[model samples]
Structure formats: structure tokens, C-alpha cells
Target: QPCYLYVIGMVLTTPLPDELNFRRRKLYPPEDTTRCFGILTAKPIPQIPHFPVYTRSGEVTISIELAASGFMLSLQMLELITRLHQYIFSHILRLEKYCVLPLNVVNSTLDIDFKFMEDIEKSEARIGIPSTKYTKETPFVFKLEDYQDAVIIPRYRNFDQPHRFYVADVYTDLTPLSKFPSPEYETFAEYYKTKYNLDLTNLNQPLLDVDHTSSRLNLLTPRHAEKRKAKWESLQNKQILVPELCAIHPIPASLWRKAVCLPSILYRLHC
Candidate 1:
């Protein structure tokens, strides 16, 4: 016998108020510095039996429980029901942050927006990369047709990750060994060597820059910087990098069904 119905689930809710009788307490008394205590007064906080609506569902058949046992029968049932309902309600609330409505309450009645679904589908392959110590060989790789935007976070002793450069092109013609004369040293190489005891290699590789916006006149220049030589300017901004010294920040995946053994798309459409 099937029939359309609304099921109202009920659970025993307890009355628990915060900050009981001993709400105020002293950390330490002047008489003895090591003594600390809070006194509980005969407060008029009362406890009462409560019935709360645990959940509501439509078009379902629900059977109410019946106790046919001993002295602990009613108490046991109350505890069991309350615990289960608390768990279920809390789980639903936790999931509510990720989406609009509770799935069970709506029960496929509401149709999700297409754009939201698409965003979720694309996010399926997203992976997190921790900011750990990085080496040239262990750097995270990116697949790009030409250029990809990345943030350069310089990490070294005294020089922290607070200094960040958002670069338009991750590819640059700058290298660690590209010598530029500085006030501190005759050349950039000597400056790094003397100050940080660092020896740079890979003279042929390119380095990253700050950004194009910074390159704009009065735009990207470090206004208050004490250094006189801002001559290492490239792509407008006065930022060049030693590749191995800085870490590249990220972009924030899925496989296809491998059954259809078809030819590669490039050759399959050849002729």
C-alpha cells in the first residue's frame, strides 16, 4: 500500500545552558598566589523535557519505535534517538556550507544551476601543493603552450616570503649569473656572494619580473627603496630573479574512459 506522506522525525532535546553557577572566578588570590577557585551557587536554572523536530522528509513511510523491555527501556531509547539525530543534523549542517540547500530536505526537488555544476566538475582535478622547500629538479611543473602567469615568492634567510612578484610571463631572459653593478658590490654576483654566501649557476636561463603594471612610469617603481640603481629594469618593472632562489606559486585534473582504442585525433582527421 503506497501513499504520498510527510514524515516528521522527533528527538529528545535536553535543556543545557552555558556558564553555570560558577560563571565568575578569580585566577589567583592575594592570600596565596597559588590558590584559585570558583564557587558554585544554588542558581535557579531549571531543566525540562524537550521534544525537537529532528528532520522532515516527504513521501516516505516511517515506523515509530516501541519499547517492550525493562526499567532502562525508556532511558535507553531516549539516549539512542537523541544521539542519532544530533549526528545526522550536524552532518547536514556541515555540508550546508558547500552548497545552498540540504540535499535530503530538497530531495531532488530543486535543480542545481548549470554553471555551479560545471565549476564543481572542473574543480574535481584540483590538487593542493604545499609551500615546502623546493629545488630546481623538484619544482612543480606546468604544461603551457606558450606562457603561464605565476607569482614569484622569494624565500631565503632575512629575505622572507613577504616579498611577492606577480609576473605576466613566467618566461624571462634573466639569469642568476646575469651580472648587474650594485652599490654594495662591484657586481650582482659579488653582492650575493658577500652578503648571503650564495653562488649562482645556470647563466643561460631566464628570470622572472615583477609585472607590466609596475613597469609603467610612477607605477611599478619601488618608491621608498633606498637603492640608487634601479637599472635592472625589464618589461617595465625593476624586478629580476635568481630562479633557484624563489618559488613559483600555483594554478588552482581527470581521465577519459580508455576502452575505445581509437587513433590519435591529430592523425585520425589527417585524411
Candidate 2:
């Protein structure tokens, strides 16, 4: 017999920049200055809701929601995200090794195609005009006298805002993929190259692609169900684990002081 599952709903939330700082200070000793930078100064970016998992006839299906200008736009973003998942699974994390499969489903009725790309591009260009000029009258205009003959613009245009943005709700069923070796993780680099044709070799490269895409996804979809699940899971596991050799046991006042003082000391060392 075949089984089917439907997505009821989703909800998501992100920590404020201040929340990240507090959490970071709590986790690492203050002496770890490298991890302290941007802990507070960084902006609060949004995150996607957790993926949904469904099982039927030994096969799992994942579903996500995304935004669209109408219907077409949503479909395009969904397709893009689907391709991204496949690319990441195949080349980055090798999900096949874990026996996971990715699938995309559009809950809306829409048609997305190349023609829609032009509208998306034009809308983005209009939004990006402000970064170039300080004043409206002194609008930054490029004189293409030299380039006119060449028939190509030599320099890239700068913009205050970015283009090509969308939000995606990602869902996956890992029941098939969970039968793998322990150290399980996936990297964002492989997704970029496959989805957007960009290469991110160094892990330190700016996560603009990830941030932009993730943020857009958040705005488009909510992750209410995931939040509830996480809350329940936390409540179920209320025990804390601490090493026995430590005088502090789980948490001691001295350890708290060390946590606060270490970052300040390390910051001074760098200067």
C-alpha cells in the first residue's frame, strides 16, 4: 500500500543580534577572542524553518514553502532550491552515502519561466539605484561614450541593495539517509556552485549567498511547527551533562567569571 502526507503549516524565528552575543559568551571562554569578534556587532539575519519529514511505503517526502511575485515566482525559487539540494547532496555532503533523497513540491498553482526572470531583474535594478548616488539631483550616471563604441559596459555597477532574492521552506526525510557513519554534516559551499554557479572554496568567504537566500526564505515562509517540536524536545531532555573532575560540576561562579573575563583579555592581546 502507498501512503501520503500533507504539510499542515510551518513557523520560524531568528535570534536578535544581542541574543547571539549572550549565547556566544556563555558557550566559549572569554580568552577565545577569535570567536568573539562580530558576536555583538553582527546584524541579526533570519533563518529558515526546519525541514519537515514524512514517510510512506519506506519512502520519505520533504516539502517546503517559498514566496512568489504571483505564483510563477514561487515555483522558480522552489525549483532553484530543489536543484540546490540535489547539488549539495551529490557533491557536498554526499547524502546518497547516507541514503537520503531530496524532492521539491510546489503547494501553489503557478507557471515560472525565463520571461519572468526579466521582471525579477528589473525590479531588483530599481531597488539598487540608491547606493550609487549621494543625492537625487547628482544622480550617478555613467557616460558610455567610450563604452558605446565598444558595445559593452567595462565596469560593474554598484548597488546598495542586492538582486536575485527568494525565501524557501526546505523539508527533508532523513529516515533513509540516517543509516550512515557518525560525523554527519553538510557544507554550504557545494550548494552555491551548483545552484548559482559561484565557487566558495575557503570556508571563510562572506556568506552573502547563504544569508541572502536564507533571509528571503524566512520572509516568505513561517516555521511554526518546527519551533513547537524543538521546544518539546528540549523539555523532554532536561538533564545537564558535566565532567566529574571539574570542581564546578555543571556550572560554578568561578567558571562564569572566567567566561566573562577571557574574551576581554583576548581582545586586548590582539591589539
Candidate 3:
């Protein structure tokens, strides 16, 4: 049977607060108040930027910002839950698995504020193109009318089915928030311990010192010398002796020699 794997993204609740209140008589507010909501008082707005990419094939890249923003919000909530007096650890569930994909996470301001000036400057610097010669071109912009909330849902799939789908890689752009240097590791560890009651002593066991008397090398053993010779030969065989030679059909010797020898001459001064 052919096996298949599938992934889906879901937002359990909208970013806005609940619609009901005892004093407010209206069941739901008229259209004006739908999207308006106040930020959580405990958590400050994180400084992260997000951007959109376009391909040569006329396909505009999807927003990775939505997922990144969700992750940041979730992390903030987890921290809040830990600080609560009646915190219940069982209330939290592992709702998502972040997999590897091609999505790029940029600063949060890129999409919200439309600030691509720094991106343009960086591009020019990378390509050795001076700012004087490069003219300022407006980056791609999208209006609120063009914005649509993506249909993100979590679904289960059978192993014996074939499916084709797009998978978005998750990423975050939030900078370390602590004031002291080397505080990121400490912060994450503290969160894990306080929130989940997890012990992290075994997480970095490879860094600890152990016995190493048996690891010393002995030059006189024939078996060890033979193994060493084999390893050396394997490494030599893997080396790219003629990287300039094209993988395609045969080319002229002069061209091949020029390509191969050019790097040696360029680096001759270092020797």
C-alpha cells in the first residue's frame, strides 16, 4: 500500500476577545467593532518583522507571518499561565508540530508598516552595488482589501492514501527579551522548569567530562595502523581533485586547465 503524510494548520480561537458581556446588551457588535481589540496588558508587543516573497513564475509567496505571530502569542500565553495562582498544567495541549520547509520569517514591521527600505539597502550592499547607482524602487504592497485569512485547519490522514499539498515551514523572528547577556538560555530553561516542571539535567550530557584513558593512540599496533591507512585513503579518494571539470560532455584541455589552475594562482600570495 502507498503511504501518505499530510499537515494542516489551525487557529483554535481568533486573536480578538470573546463577544459576550453581562452589561453589554448587544449579542454581537455592529460591523465597526469586529476587528478592533486591545492587546494583552501583561505581554508587550514583540519586536519581529515579516515579509512576503515573489517568484519569477508570477506566484506570490504566502504569509509566514501569521504562523510566526501565532507562535509568539502562544509562547506569551504559556508564560502567563505559569504566573497564575491557580495555574492548571493539564490545560495546555501540544496543538502543533513545526516542521522544516522553505518559509522565511522577517521582521514583523515588514508587512504591517511596509518598510522595505532597509532590505533594499542590504541587497545593494550584498551585491557590491553602490547606493548612488541603485535607484529606490517601491517594494510590493498589499491593501487591507487584498488581505484574506488563510483556511488553516488541523486534519488527520490515513497512511494508505496518496495526497499532494503545500507545507509551510514555521519560524520566529523575536529577539531575546532579557536585559542581561547570555540570558536567553536561562530564560527558556526557567520557563520550562516553572511551567512544565521538567528536569533538564540530562539535556546536555555530552558536555560533561568522563573517562578517556582508553582513547589514547598507540602507534605500534598493526591493526590500528591498517585502520588509519584505510581512513586516510577514503578521505583522499573523496577529495575534489578537479572541481573545474564540468560534469557534462568533454571540453578542451586548455579551458579545463585554466579553470583548474586559476584558483591556485589567486591564492599563491597566501603561501
lDDT of each: 0.30, 0.24, 0.21
Query: Which portions of model 2 show Cα errors greater than 4 Å?
Result: 6-10, 19-88, 96-271
Measured against the true structure, the TM-scores of the candidates, in listed sequence, are 0.31, 0.17, 0.13
**Highest lDDT, which number?**
1
Candidate 3, overall lDDT? 0.21
List, residue by residue over 101-210, the lDDT tens digit for candidate 3.
11111432112111222232233222221222112253222222211111111111122321111111111221112221234444433544454453333221111111
RMSD in order of candidates: 25.9, 25.4, 30.7
Evaluated at residue 199, the lDDT of candidate 2 is: 34
Q: 1-271 in candidate 1: lDDT tens per residue?
A: 1111111112213222233313121111111211111111122112222222111110111111211111222444334334433322232112121011101122313221233223422531122222454446655333342124344445554242134444534445444555664565665556667888865554445655454212111111111252444444332355565555555433110000000001111112122
Of 1 and 3, the candidate ahead on TM-score is: 1
Let me know the TM-score candidate 3 reaches against the reference structure: 0.13
How many steric overlaps are in each model, in order? Answer: 4, 13, 7
lDDT of 2: 0.24
Q: State the lDDT at 100 in candidate 2.
A: 14
